[PDB]
Amino acid sequence: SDVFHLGLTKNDLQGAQLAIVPGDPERVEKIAALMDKPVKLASHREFTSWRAELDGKAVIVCSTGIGGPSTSIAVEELAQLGIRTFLRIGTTGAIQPHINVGDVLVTTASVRLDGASLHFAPMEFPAVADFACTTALVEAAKSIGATTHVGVTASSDTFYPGQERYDTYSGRVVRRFKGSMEEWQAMGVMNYEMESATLLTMCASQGLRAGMVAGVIVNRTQQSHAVKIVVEAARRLL
Amino acid sequence: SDVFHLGLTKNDLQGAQLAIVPGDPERVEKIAALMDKPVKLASHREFTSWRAELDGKAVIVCSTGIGGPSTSIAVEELAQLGIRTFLRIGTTGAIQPHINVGDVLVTTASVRLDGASLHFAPMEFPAVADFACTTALVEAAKSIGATTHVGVTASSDTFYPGQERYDTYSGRVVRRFKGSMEEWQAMGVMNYEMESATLLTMCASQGLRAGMVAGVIVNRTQQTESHAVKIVVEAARRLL
Amino acid sequence: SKSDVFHLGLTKNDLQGAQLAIVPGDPERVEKIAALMDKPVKLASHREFTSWRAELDGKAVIVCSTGIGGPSTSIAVEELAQLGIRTFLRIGTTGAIQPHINVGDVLVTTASVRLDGASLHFAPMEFPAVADFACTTALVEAAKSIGATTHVGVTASSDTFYPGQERYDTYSGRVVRRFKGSMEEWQAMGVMNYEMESATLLTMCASQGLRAGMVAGVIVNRTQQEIPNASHAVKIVVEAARRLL
Amino acid sequence: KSDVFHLGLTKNDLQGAQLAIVPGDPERVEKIAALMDKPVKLASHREFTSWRAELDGKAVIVCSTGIGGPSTSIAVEELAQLGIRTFLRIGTTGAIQPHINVGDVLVTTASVRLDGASLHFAPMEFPAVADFACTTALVEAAKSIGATTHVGVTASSDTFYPGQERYDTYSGRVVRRFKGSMEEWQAMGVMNYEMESATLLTMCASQGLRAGMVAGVIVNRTQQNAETMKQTESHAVKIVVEAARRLL
Amino acid sequence: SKSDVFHLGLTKNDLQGAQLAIVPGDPERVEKIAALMDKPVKLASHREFTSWRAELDGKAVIVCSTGIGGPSTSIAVEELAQLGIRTFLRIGTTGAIQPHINVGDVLVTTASVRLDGASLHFAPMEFPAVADFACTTALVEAAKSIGATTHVGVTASSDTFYPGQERYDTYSGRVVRRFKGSMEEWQAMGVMNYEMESATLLTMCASQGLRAGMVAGVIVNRTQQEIPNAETMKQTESHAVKIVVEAARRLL
Amino acid sequence: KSDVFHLGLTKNDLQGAQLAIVPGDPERVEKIAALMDKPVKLASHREFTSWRAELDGKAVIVCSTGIGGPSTSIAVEELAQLGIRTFLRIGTTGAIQPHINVGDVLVTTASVRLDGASLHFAPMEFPAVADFACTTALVEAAKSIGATTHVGVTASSDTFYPGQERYDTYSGRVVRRFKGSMEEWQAMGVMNYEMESATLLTMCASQGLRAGMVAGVIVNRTQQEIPNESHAVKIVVEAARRLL
């Protein structure tokens, strides 16, 4: 292994320069299967990796696990191995009532409610997506007629208090996050997730290209699509 | 007059919903004159405003002055009058060795080295440009074959120490900015300027669309304004 | 001649030995202030920086506009210092936040609340945005000599006119968390007024061996309204200049 | 079926357990549970593998957290919902002090908060401090088997690389905040780096939960593997289970 | 007027090999604490720094006041360290903020909320104001020997007596935004009490290889109605004081 | 009897006094009160020693604050509760400018807030600024007494050692925030270090109380770290005269 966590060598990538990076190891093979010659590479902790081919070019699919810290290990070590473009694919809730289950969100930049991003760039630096990646995702979305929202996502180091959830053991939310969801809503933030501030900041500050797309599956303010998009986007970025 | 600083009324805009916003009052008329039926509206402080027409639709050209604070006044008051899309056009140096004079920069988001942006959103919020505006600018730059760089800009509340200039009265740069230019360079930041962090943050946080394009007139390493102007107007056509 | 500085379009010769500048925010006010002095002459006009020279008791004086905000102020002050100015007197307009302060009153600033960003490019937040003792003394004693209604104290200096001065009559009608309830807080702490340049001016001068003073005329009382419906301070800044030459 | 969103567990599955041993790696869970009575698999979802066992007639949970504060915060919250009130983290670690040797045991009294998740529970001023009873039990368990034990402060980082001032990376760059930082923590007596304890200790200390942490030292950067890690692993594992015994 | 240090007026000889100091805030308490040990003698008194030496189980020990606050505490601790002290035990008085913590109770602090400024002169805010495990163990065991109702946990350490502890009974009657609603916040987070020296003491020791512990007697509860008289408050002091001396015995 | 928690004073003890002179060292209180008429000891508790005196027929209080912002914040608050509305601090200080000599008198217009207690009264953005009248009184008193005087910004530290970048210490090191800080302040024209002014000035300026600050230079830090006063004390008494 050329790296400490992933269990991969540069040779294993067979010249891959682009990686699709879901959170859950169990999504990896499903994504790789949309491409030619899918083969498993390795599986260590929450990092499962597969290689496939897109129009002749090798591509990697590697899970990140939950959160910025796990994500930062995967991106660093994939970068060491030669990956230069990262496409995050996820499922997500939403915090805007005009956003429906089934919609697709493309993130231009993230609110940095995490900690790992600060290990790459100070807070003043924008957790912004690469323009080429965002363009590819948006146009891939249009080509399958998906209803898409493009904008800012809030990226939280917690699932509970940082997303202002009160349905918890203590039922309390620290001062910093009390009233925060309404504030993000008013500022036009589409949704919460947990990895994108780290991903976007570490790539934008290190010369790597990153993009993120997500399918909306729930919406707290209410009572395969996204995967096709990310793979279609990947072929425009090879 | 309606708004307090600009001296403009809703009627003056004649239905305009897009404004091109340069920094220098003296560049306003020049930009308006590239379009149809240019007419001067008002001039107060650093805020000179003209109206013109692009494909039969009224557009505004209004100067911002230097810095987030005056920028924030212009954008606020224009939004009060119905403007919903803002395109900044500037002149700029560069901090990357490969970025040449004559090159055009399109800003996806800014490093927030200002103060005014914090009056709209906390620092964790990204000073990010609107996707449609940035797309329009990039496509307009392809249209005229300009050499374009797209990426992150550092937006400073000062021309001197915040851009790590030592050729100054005191020769001093405060701890926070000592070594900062090298830092931004390694992080891939293209350039310094003085308004975009405020513009982008105030717009992205209030449902307004903003983009920014700048022509490079010099390079901090190693030391076409019309080309950047041509791009901003052509991008404006696509956003009407 | 080729300008000695990048923005102002001036040479050291243009100053004729001047070491003091009166610095209004509005370019259009420059001529008016210089007119109150001897031998007023227009020097230059670039962007928001209009400059005039004049004479006071036989001494050359500069009047130069800053534009609104710390950033444009920081350029004017830096470049004037390069040209030889060592004393700066800001003359501005202001919104009062104390109920008994009348429109037209003159406020002399001892130090400012740093609600700006440019001051941080000169000194960390812990450093006081304090006025020079000589300049403040000249302003207070000038204000006394002509009998103006005058208040002396702390000013809040904001990078915005709207949310940072907790104005709600705006496009969004919203004010970010940091500034919600802020005016009442400054009011309780005895802060006199809001304006937009002094924190930068006072910080960059006090931390770089330059003298600065700050005086402003009240144009709206914020305990009553956000925007006005629609001179003493000016006589004062000129008289104070006289005492500091 | 489940009483919580991620863990795939119900209160019934815990059979009244109030104490959880929380390793990072799902692979270690079975190993830990194996040192106790009546061990059995419960569930595995994402990085959260849980087993139940019994000590002195009382049920105990072993549940992995994954890497980092964010996944740790989910496991701790959901375990608390299910009734857990005491959490013992067990890890393997490097050391940053010249005189902390491979094979030594570290018991953490509190952590430097170089993470993000802790701030979602308390402002930075609040100490990422371990519970006294837990720390006491760990230190006493360590003594009962003659380990060389260091008790003190741990630095808890959201990253493996720049937050631990590693330059052997793709960029070879460390952000200003962390340039020279390892030397600073060293001079302040910080024992080691790891990635979960600031979140664990802060969230528990500020919500009336008891937490402790023990780790075995398997490497030392300032000092310059295979069977030893396994040996060290087994030793800190022995300690965390002996400590749990005292805490039931 | 021989002194090895700038403020305390003490020399290394004065310590007679002492390596442990008991550090109350009030100079008037020093003689009282020294009187619980053997052959106490007064060493010096300058500003808020009064110091005595005594013997505990045959070994010299110093008792030296810190004054109120982290700044004067930082001077005393630094100068005692220069003189050879390696272990510091603070004995204080405190206001409890939990309803279940009664006047007369003894609090042992494991770590403190850093609502001070001096601690930042030793370590950035991320660093824990944490007590030494041996000192804390010694205090807890001593409480058991003396017999006391003891609580062990987190203390909020404030640079002020008034707004930082969210008191409105003041000249201005206001509390700055940062501290408005803060007492209820610390209460929900399990914080036992407020005092004014521990964040500085604990941080400066924990980051410099010195051992520190903190014990306090509760003289008032911010949630209760009845304010104990100054007399019954004296007995609580005496109780915590006995515990700090007994704790010292285990650390020599 | 006492109307306040720490000082051991009743309103009646002040005899209508509205101005206090506040030195750091309790032992200096008696000395300062002696320069005035009818000096009488009031109380001594912890680091708070208080005397009353008379200046041109009006009662004046002299009360020590102890070292640092926290004990200072207690004395100021409690004196305010008892009716004091003007506070003049008289201290000792280490100068950090080459051209300022031992024995010079420094008048502080405002302070760098290297403390923590000030933040309990106002956020960091608020200036730790002296009252204009008090500052004016001190500057004019210095002319009257005759002293080499400098007027400007002071750095006010919560520590004597690392916050004033002292290296004659047990650890011999200083935390990152303060490494190279003295030279930074010197370049910014800061005159001197002391330990109470940021808290005093902030708490007063933000609460409608008047405060001023004067100090005698006991060491010059560009030459020496550990030291090696009457001018400064005569000045604060003469200034009090003008503020009555």
mmCIF file with all atom_site columns, C-alpha atoms in Angstrom, chain B residues 71-135:
data_model
loop_
_atom_site.group_PDB
_atom_site.id
_atom_site.type_symbol
_atom_site.label_atom_id
_atom_site.label_alt_id
_atom_site.label_comp_id
_atom_site.label_asym_id
_atom_site.label_entity_id
_atom_site.label_seq_id
_atom_site.pdbx_PDB_ins_code
_atom_site.Cartn_x
_atom_site.Cartn_y
_atom_site.Cartn_z
_atom_site.occupancy
_atom_site.B_iso_or_equiv
_atom_site.pdbx_formal_charge
_atom_site.auth_seq_id
_atom_site.auth_comp_id
_atom_site.auth_asym_id
_atom_site.auth_atom_id
_atom_site.pdbx_PDB_model_num
ATOM 1  C CA . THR B 1 71  ? -20.574 48.784 -2.211  1.00 0.00 ? 71  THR B CA 1
ATOM 2  C CA . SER B 1 72  ? -23.082 47.656 0.405   1.00 0.00 ? 72  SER B CA 1
ATOM 3  C CA . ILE B 1 73  ? -24.946 50.974 0.192   1.00 0.00 ? 73  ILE B CA 1
ATOM 4  C CA . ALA B 1 74  ? -25.212 50.865 -3.595  1.00 0.00 ? 74  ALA B CA 1
ATOM 5  C CA . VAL B 1 75  ? -26.403 47.249 -3.715  1.00 0.00 ? 75  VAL B CA 1
ATOM 6  C CA . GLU B 1 76  ? -28.925 47.774 -0.902  1.00 0.00 ? 76  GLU B CA 1
ATOM 7  C CA . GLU B 1 77  ? -30.433 50.884 -2.467  1.00 0.00 ? 77  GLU B CA 1
ATOM 8  C CA . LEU B 1 78  ? -30.540 49.399 -5.983  1.00 0.00 ? 78  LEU B CA 1
ATOM 9  C CA . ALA B 1 79  ? -32.260 46.298 -4.566  1.00 0.00 ? 79  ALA B CA 1
ATOM 10 C CA . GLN B 1 80  ? -34.803 48.615 -2.910  1.00 0.00 ? 80  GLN B CA 1
ATOM 11 C CA . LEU B 1 81  ? -35.439 50.018 -6.406  1.00 0.00 ? 81  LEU B CA 1
ATOM 12 C CA . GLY B 1 82  ? -35.942 46.569 -7.941  1.00 0.00 ? 82  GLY B CA 1
ATOM 13 C CA . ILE B 1 83  ? -32.503 45.397 -9.097  1.00 0.00 ? 83  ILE B CA 1
ATOM 14 C CA . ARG B 1 84  ? -32.107 41.624 -8.538  1.00 0.00 ? 84  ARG B CA 1
ATOM 15 C CA . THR B 1 85  ? -28.955 40.789 -10.514 1.00 0.00 ? 85  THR B CA 1
ATOM 16 C CA . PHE B 1 86  ? -25.600 42.542 -10.033 1.00 0.00 ? 86  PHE B CA 1
ATOM 17 C CA . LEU B 1 87  ? -22.506 42.167 -12.211 1.00 0.00 ? 87  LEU B CA 1
ATOM 18 C CA . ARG B 1 88  ? -19.293 43.687 -10.857 1.00 0.00 ? 88  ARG B CA 1
ATOM 19 C CA . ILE B 1 89  ? -16.686 44.725 -13.411 1.00 0.00 ? 89  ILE B CA 1
ATOM 20 C CA . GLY B 1 90  ? -13.230 45.641 -12.148 1.00 0.00 ? 90  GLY B CA 1
ATOM 21 C CA . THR B 1 91  ? -9.594  46.104 -13.069 1.00 0.00 ? 91  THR B CA 1
ATOM 22 C CA . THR B 1 92  ? -7.168  43.925 -11.160 1.00 0.00 ? 92  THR B CA 1
ATOM 23 C CA . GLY B 1 93  ? -3.633  42.729 -10.629 1.00 0.00 ? 93  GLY B CA 1
ATOM 24 C CA . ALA B 1 94  ? -2.876  39.072 -9.980  1.00 0.00 ? 94  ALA B CA 1
ATOM 25 C CA . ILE B 1 95  ? -0.875  36.965 -7.503  1.00 0.00 ? 95  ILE B CA 1
ATOM 26 C CA . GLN B 1 96  ? -0.217  33.911 -9.658  1.00 0.00 ? 96  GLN B CA 1
ATOM 27 C CA . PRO B 1 97  ? 2.932   33.928 -11.851 1.00 0.00 ? 97  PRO B CA 1
ATOM 28 C CA . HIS B 1 98  ? 1.152   32.513 -14.914 1.00 0.00 ? 98  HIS B CA 1
ATOM 29 C CA . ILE B 1 99  ? -1.657  35.088 -14.969 1.00 0.00 ? 99  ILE B CA 1
ATOM 30 C CA . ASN B 1 100 ? -0.872  37.672 -17.635 1.00 0.00 ? 100 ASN B CA 1
ATOM 31 C CA . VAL B 1 101 ? -1.884  41.263 -18.275 1.00 0.00 ? 101 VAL B CA 1
ATOM 32 C CA . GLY B 1 102 ? -4.825  41.190 -20.663 1.00 0.00 ? 102 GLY B CA 1
ATOM 33 C CA . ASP B 1 103 ? -6.195  38.088 -18.961 1.00 0.00 ? 103 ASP B CA 1
ATOM 34 C CA . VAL B 1 104 ? -9.731  38.177 -17.568 1.00 0.00 ? 104 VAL B CA 1
ATOM 35 C CA . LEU B 1 105 ? -10.629 36.735 -14.155 1.00 0.00 ? 105 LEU B CA 1
ATOM 36 C CA . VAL B 1 106 ? -14.035 35.320 -13.263 1.00 0.00 ? 106 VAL B CA 1
ATOM 37 C CA . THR B 1 107 ? -14.594 34.926 -9.537  1.00 0.00 ? 107 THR B CA 1
ATOM 38 C CA . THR B 1 108 ? -16.447 31.866 -8.214  1.00 0.00 ? 108 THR B CA 1
ATOM 39 C CA . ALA B 1 109 ? -16.113 32.950 -4.582  1.00 0.00 ? 109 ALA B CA 1
ATOM 40 C CA . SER B 1 110 ? -13.978 35.221 -2.431  1.00 0.00 ? 110 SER B CA 1
ATOM 41 C CA . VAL B 1 111 ? -11.723 35.008 0.601   1.00 0.00 ? 111 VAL B CA 1
ATOM 42 C CA . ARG B 1 112 ? -13.462 37.296 3.080   1.00 0.00 ? 112 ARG B CA 1
ATOM 43 C CA . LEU B 1 113 ? -10.720 39.715 4.170   1.00 0.00 ? 113 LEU B CA 1
ATOM 44 C CA . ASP B 1 114 ? -13.237 42.491 4.599   1.00 0.00 ? 114 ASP B CA 1
ATOM 45 C CA . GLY B 1 115 ? -15.550 43.623 7.341   1.00 0.00 ? 115 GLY B CA 1
ATOM 46 C CA . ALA B 1 116 ? -18.840 44.468 5.669   1.00 0.00 ? 116 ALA B CA 1
ATOM 47 C CA . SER B 1 117 ? -19.585 40.882 4.625   1.00 0.00 ? 117 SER B CA 1
ATOM 48 C CA . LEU B 1 118 ? -19.870 40.028 8.345   1.00 0.00 ? 118 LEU B CA 1
ATOM 49 C CA . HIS B 1 119 ? -22.772 42.461 8.600   1.00 0.00 ? 119 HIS B CA 1
ATOM 50 C CA . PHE B 1 120 ? -24.734 40.090 6.323   1.00 0.00 ? 120 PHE B CA 1
ATOM 51 C CA . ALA B 1 121 ? -23.600 36.619 7.291   1.00 0.00 ? 121 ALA B CA 1
ATOM 52 C CA . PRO B 1 122 ? -21.200 35.039 9.753   1.00 0.00 ? 122 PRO B CA 1
ATOM 53 C CA . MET B 1 123 ? -17.716 34.119 8.467   1.00 0.00 ? 123 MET B CA 1
ATOM 54 C CA . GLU B 1 124 ? -18.674 30.448 7.989   1.00 0.00 ? 124 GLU B CA 1
ATOM 55 C CA . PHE B 1 125 ? -20.977 31.556 5.137   1.00 0.00 ? 125 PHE B CA 1
ATOM 56 C CA . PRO B 1 126 ? -19.354 31.417 1.687   1.00 0.00 ? 126 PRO B CA 1
ATOM 57 C CA . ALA B 1 127 ? -18.880 34.623 -0.337  1.00 0.00 ? 127 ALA B CA 1
ATOM 58 C CA . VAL B 1 128 ? -20.043 32.681 -3.358  1.00 0.00 ? 128 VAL B CA 1
ATOM 59 C CA . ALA B 1 129 ? -21.183 33.975 -6.746  1.00 0.00 ? 129 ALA B CA 1
ATOM 60 C CA . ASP B 1 130 ? -24.440 33.063 -8.446  1.00 0.00 ? 130 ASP B CA 1
ATOM 61 C CA . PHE B 1 131 ? -24.049 30.100 -10.800 1.00 0.00 ? 131 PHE B CA 1
ATOM 62 C CA . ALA B 1 132 ? -26.070 31.689 -13.635 1.00 0.00 ? 132 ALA B CA 1
ATOM 63 C CA . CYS B 1 133 ? -24.053 34.919 -13.475 1.00 0.00 ? 133 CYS B CA 1
ATOM 64 C CA . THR B 1 134 ? -20.700 33.137 -13.393 1.00 0.00 ? 134 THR B CA 1
ATOM 65 C CA . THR B 1 135 ? -21.824 30.916 -16.277 1.00 0.00 ? 135 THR B CA 1
#
